[PDB]
Amino acid sequence: KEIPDVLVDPRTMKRYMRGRFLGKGGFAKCYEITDMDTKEVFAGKVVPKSMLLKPHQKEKMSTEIAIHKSLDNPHVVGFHGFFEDDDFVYVVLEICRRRSLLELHKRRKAVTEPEARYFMRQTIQGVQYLHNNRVIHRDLKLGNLFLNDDMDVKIGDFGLATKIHSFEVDIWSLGCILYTLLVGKPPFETSCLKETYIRIKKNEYSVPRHINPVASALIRRMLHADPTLRPSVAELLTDEFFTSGYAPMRLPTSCLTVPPR
Ligand SMILES: Cc1nn(-c2cc(Cl)cc(-c3ccccc3C(N)=O)c2)c2cc(N[C@@H](C)c3ccccc3)ncc12
Numbered sequence: 001k002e003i004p005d006v007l008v009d010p011r012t013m014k015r016y017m018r019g020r021f022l023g024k025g026g027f028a029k030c031y032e033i034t035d036m037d038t039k040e041v042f043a044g045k046v047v048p049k050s051m052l053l054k055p056h057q058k059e060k061m062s063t064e065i066a067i068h069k070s071l072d073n074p075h076v077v078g079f080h081g082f083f084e085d086d087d088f089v090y091v092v093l094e095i096c097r098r099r100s101l102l103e104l105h106k107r108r109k110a111v112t113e114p115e116a117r118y119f120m121r122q123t124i125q126g127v128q129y130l131h132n133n134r135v136i137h138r139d140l141k142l143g144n145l146f147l148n149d150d151m152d153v154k155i156g157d158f159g160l161a162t163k164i165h166s167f168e169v170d171i172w173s174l175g176c177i178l179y180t181l182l183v184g185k186p187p188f189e190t191s192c193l194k195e196t197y198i199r200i201k202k203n204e205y206s207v208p209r210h211i212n213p214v215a216s217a218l219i220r221r222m223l224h225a226d227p228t229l230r231p232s233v234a235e236l237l238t239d240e241f242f243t244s245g246y247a248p249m250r251l252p253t254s255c256l257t258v259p260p261r
Pocket of ligand 1: 144
C-alpha cells in the first residue's frame with residue numbers, strides 16, 4: 001500500500017509533498033514533508049491503520065497526540081497538527097535535521113564537559129516545562145533529544161508520556177544521559193537485557209575515577225535509589241556542575257563529529 005506523494009487533510013486543507021525518507025520507528029515511517037503552499041519543511045510521522053487495527057493500540061497514539069498537541073516550548077519538538085486518510089494516520093512535527101543526541105554520542109563517545117553543560121541545561125529546561133505543565137515524559141533517552149541546524153536540543157517521542165512512580169523517573173533518565181555524555185558508555189550497559197534490569201534494581205553502576213568529582217556527585221543524586229532523594233528539575237539548573245565550569249550558550253555543528261576548540 002503506497003503512501004501518497006501529496007498528503008492532504010480534510011481539516012486545514014493543506015497539501016504536503018512527501019520528500020526524502022528519514023527513518024522508521026517500529027510501525028511508523030518518517031518522511032520530510034513540505035507544505036506545498038508555504039514551502040515550510042516538517043517531519044511527518046506516517047502510521048498505517050493496519051498497525052492500529054486494535055482499539056487498544058489506537059488509544060496510545062491518541063494519548064500521545066493529546067499531550068504533544070498541547071505542548072509549546074523552544075525545547076520540545078513542535079506539534080503542528082495531525083490527520084488521517086483511510087490508510088494512514090499522519091502527524092506533522094518539527095524537523096530536526098541534525099538527528100538526535102544518540103548519533104552524536106556514537107560518533108563522539110565521551111563529550112567534553114562544557115558540551116555536556118550545554119546539552120543538559122537545554123534538555124533540563126525542556127523537562128522543567130513538561131513538569132510544570134504536569135507532564136511526565138517517562139522515556140527520556142539520547143534518541144529523544146533531537147537536534148536542529150542550530151544544535152538546539154528539542155525533546156520528542158511522547159509515546160510513553162503521561163499527564164497528572166512520578167516526576168523523579170525523568171530525573172533518573174536524565175542521570176543516565178549525563179553519565180553517557182560524560183563517560184562515553186551507558187551506566188547500565190550490558191549485552192543481556194535481563195541483566196540490565198538486575199543492574200537497575202540493585203542500583204549497580206560505578207562512575208569511573210576519571211570523571212569530575214562535582215559531576216559524579218550530581219550523577220549519583222540523580223540516580224539515587226530513593227526516588228524522593230533525587231534532585232528536582234529546578235534544583236538541577238542551579239547545581240555546582242553548571243555554575244562552576246565553562247558553559248557555552250551556542251555549539252557549532254562540528255560537535256557532531258569532533259570536539260570543539
Ligand atoms: C519529531 C521527529 N520524529 N522523528 C523520527 C520519527 C520516526 Cl517514525 C523515526 C525516527 C528515527 C529513525 C531512525 C533512528 C531513530 C529514530 C528516532 N529518533 O526515533 C525519528 C524525527 C526525525 C527527524 N529528523 C531526522 C533527520 C532523523 C532521523 C533519524 C534519527 C533522528 C532524526 N526530525 C524530527 C523527528
